[PDB]
Amino acid sequence: RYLPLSQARKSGFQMDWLSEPHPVKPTFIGTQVFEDYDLQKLVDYIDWKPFFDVWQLRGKYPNRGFPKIFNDKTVGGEARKVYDDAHNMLNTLISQKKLRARGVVGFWPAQSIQDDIHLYAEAAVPQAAEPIATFYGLRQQAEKDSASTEPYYCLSDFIAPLHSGIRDYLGLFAVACFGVEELSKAYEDDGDDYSSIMVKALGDRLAEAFAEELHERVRRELWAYCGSEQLDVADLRRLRYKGIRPAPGYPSQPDHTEKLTMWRLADIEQSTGIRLTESLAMAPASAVSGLYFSNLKSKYFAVGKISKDQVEDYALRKNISVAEVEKWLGPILGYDTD
């Protein structure tokens, strides 16, 4: 069962904006580019759990995960060998300056109207000016448990609405780890499958670590809405921090076409060289992007299956045909398509 959109909107995540702490204006409006980001600093943020699954190294309970994996006698020797070789190659890559990190971050004012999150210019009054970009959110529509107290979340519920007079802000980021594509070819031309796999796994790990480090810097020094936070990485990986960085295509907003707005607005192509292919996937493959939400009560959620009324409302909002929304939102349609 799916609730009607007109009723699912009423039971949304309502917040009292006039008593909640008013949002902090970031340190700049526009974008700032990181050209040759220090890769050595990112090594302390690398999440090694997904790295072991590239080689399908899985340990049994209770050693089922990094760094307990070194103890399990089934894989522990091989896990240690792979990890030590990864550290050796990582040191060689950073020392030789083969890989070159690159990224971009930016902030703009944001005001939510219904399920949209309209961004505005720096000096433009939100209530008396046109927006410069829009991020059309999707609201949860699936009916919840009878005893559930959860609201029907949408990404626009985390931005103060236009009528309340309170000014909110939104930021977005894009990071990449260039140079992996050439090194994989180099290690495959000379007959080295171990190095070819390892360099791509390390590139993915470095991209994720760059994303984590940039978010931690944003929360504390660029946006400064958590200036009193001094959390360690073992807490950052546990989502103990506040605020979220959802990415297009993920269960918060499964619409992959949203990346076009980000690339158009932040000028990611000219700033960093991270491209979007005809499938709307970042190139190189070791790239991460997303939007920064600074609300205290913001949390990750899954939109889930949606009904046809929301699909047509979304098509009307985005000014595209239904036959295209059904394409780009294919996996989440809750109704028969043909």
Swiss-Prot record:
Single annotated GO MF: zinc ion binding
Domain AdoMet activation intervals: 1-338
GO biological process, one term: tetrahydrofolate metabolic process
Domain of life where this protein originates: Eukaryota
Keywords, sorted A to Z: Amino-acid biosynthesis, Cobalamin, Cobalt, Cytoplasm, Disease variant, Metal-binding, Methionine biosynthesis, Methyltransferase, Phosphoprotein, Repeat, S-adenosyl-L-methionine, Transferase, Zinc
Phosphothreonine found at: T337
Principal cellular location given in the protein's record: cytoplasm
Binding sites annotated in the UniProt record for S-adenosyl-L-methionine: D47, R245, Y300, F301
Tissues showing expression: Widely expressed. Expressed at the highest levels in pancreas, heart, brain, skeletal muscle and placenta. Expressed at lower levels in lung, liver and kidney.
Domain statement: Modular enzyme with four functionally distinct domains. The isolated Hcy-binding domain catalyzes methyl transfer from free methylcobalamin to homocysteine. The Hcy-binding domain in association with the pterin-binding domain catalyzes the methylation of cob(I)alamin by methyltetrahydrofolate and the methylation of homocysteine. The B12-binding domain binds the cofactor. The AdoMet activation domain binds S-adenosyl-L-methionine. Under aerobic conditions cob(I)alamin can be converted to inactive cob(II)alamin.
Record's subunit section: Monomer. Dimer. Forms a multiprotein complex with MMACHC, MMADHC and MTRR.
Illness association: Homocystinuria-megaloblastic anemia, cblG type: An autosomal recessive inborn error of metabolism resulting from defects in the cobalamin-dependent pathway that converts homocysteine to methionine. It causes delayed psychomotor development, megaloblastic anemia, homocystinuria, and hypomethioninemia. Neural tube defects, folate-sensitive: The most common NTDs are open spina bifida (myelomeningocele) and anencephaly.
Official protein name in the record: Methionine synthase
The organism of origin for this protein: Homo sapiens
Organism taxonomic ancestry: Eukaryota, Metazoa, Chordata, Craniata, Vertebrata
Gene: MTR
Residues shown, of full length: 928 to 1265 of 1265
